[PDB]
Amino acid sequence: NGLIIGIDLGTTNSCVSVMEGGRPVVLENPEGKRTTPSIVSYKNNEIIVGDAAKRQMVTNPNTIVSIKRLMGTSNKVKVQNADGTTKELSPEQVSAQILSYLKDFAEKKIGKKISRAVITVPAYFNDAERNATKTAGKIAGLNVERIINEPTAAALAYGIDKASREMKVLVYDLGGGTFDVSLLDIAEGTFEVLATAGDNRLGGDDWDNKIIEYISAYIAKEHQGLNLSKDKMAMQRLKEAAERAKIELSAQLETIISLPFLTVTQKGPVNVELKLTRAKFEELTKPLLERTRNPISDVIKEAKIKPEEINEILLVGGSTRMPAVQKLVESMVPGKKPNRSINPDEVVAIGAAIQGGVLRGDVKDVLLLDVTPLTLSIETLGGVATPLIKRNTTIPVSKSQIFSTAQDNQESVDVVVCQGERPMSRDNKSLGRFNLGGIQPAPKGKPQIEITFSLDANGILNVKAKDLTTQKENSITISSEEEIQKMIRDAEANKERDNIIRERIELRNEGELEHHHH
């Protein structure tokens, strides 16, 4: 039936994607963000999800952070109601509020009701943890069409199932809260996790916490041991400044932590303006980073392969944007370049969306080529396909040829554009047509009409026709692996018939364009 959205339900952040026009699109939340914090808060008996919850996660004690850690268990989380009574919530219920929020903004963005999803989980998730996640989906009104592993979703996003060979893929995933490295075997559409190793208390939060310690040490040095660890608002600001500083250090060699009026003492306002260099940050966080190294070696050994047998390495998770992380992974597989070309905080959701598209059976996923797959032609006298841009021409490109009229005293020319390898235009795919009129009366072969086929870097086709005497011109702009193969097959299947046709066709004299009333 309807669309199947792909959901990465992360410990720290969540992300929702869907197939639109044969490409996966990541949907922005109402604050314009492509990921949403996996945080739920409660105030005045109102449920607050995402960015607005994160902004009060220290200051509002009703805030539920890292609920994914309790998924698959019978633990309950307590929150206070407005009246001071206590409410108990299951991990399923809290996760369902995150899913409902994603679902709601997805619906408003797409403009349709959504009732189906593919939801991702860590490779290590057992049945209790997977079933908890499925139940969360059900509570949010989503038929959970499949639960897939996060590294499997990443591999799907990178098209690794299209390799037509056995692929051994290392997926290094460093998120906000968790670290995983999984070794996948991918052959004939089957994904097997050969090994998974990691730490669910090691992620970007821990790097932030080292910056918090650095700021705190500076504060104490500059203000006689001043300690804000029990000041909730100050700690809210420190956590946010620390994450911001870290993110800047992925693109800068230094950053300034700016916290005016962090508190006020008897002596006055405490204003922090503190430099942190990338080098210092890396030194402080070295023990955290180094905890991710041995597990790489461990999964390779578990899978009973050598490092040189790894075909591809994928970087997943927002923390893999850190230069020290990328360099560490590179160091562990000499001669292989880790892939991070798909935004690593979106790649899992993208893979989930791709899986959704597959399960729906839409089969629409288009290609993005830098060379023309099929020949582009104009219809000439007798229904002949006269080529303008030959197949396998690198785009962008413009090609021109001059044509004449097919009949004496012809007033206009039809410009019929077709795609395919067959010699008769009717046997190829019609891409569109237009007419160019105002041609002055003359014998057939006398008028001269310049035809130009132009393909831009985006692969969009502009066909222009200019009468070289009158200077009048008209044009049009023209708006799938299986369809390309179907057309090549049609030519292959009629090769002998078409050769006989071609033997009657001489393209070397000036071509002529007909006009037929419609």
Ligand SMILES: Nc1ncnc2c1ncn2[C@@H]1O[C@H](COP(=O)(O)OP(=O)(O)NP(=O)(O)O)[C@@H](O)[C@H]1O
């Ligand atoms: N440019 C960047 N540089 C450094 N860290 C970043 C960057 N962008 C995002 N992050 C961090 O990436 C982490 C979030 O990763 P993300 O993959 O979105 O979380 P997740 O999928 O919930 N994984 P987990 O928390 O392990 O379940 C946070 O610690 C962010 O601060």
Ligand SMILES: [Mg+2]
């Ligand atoms: Mg993720």
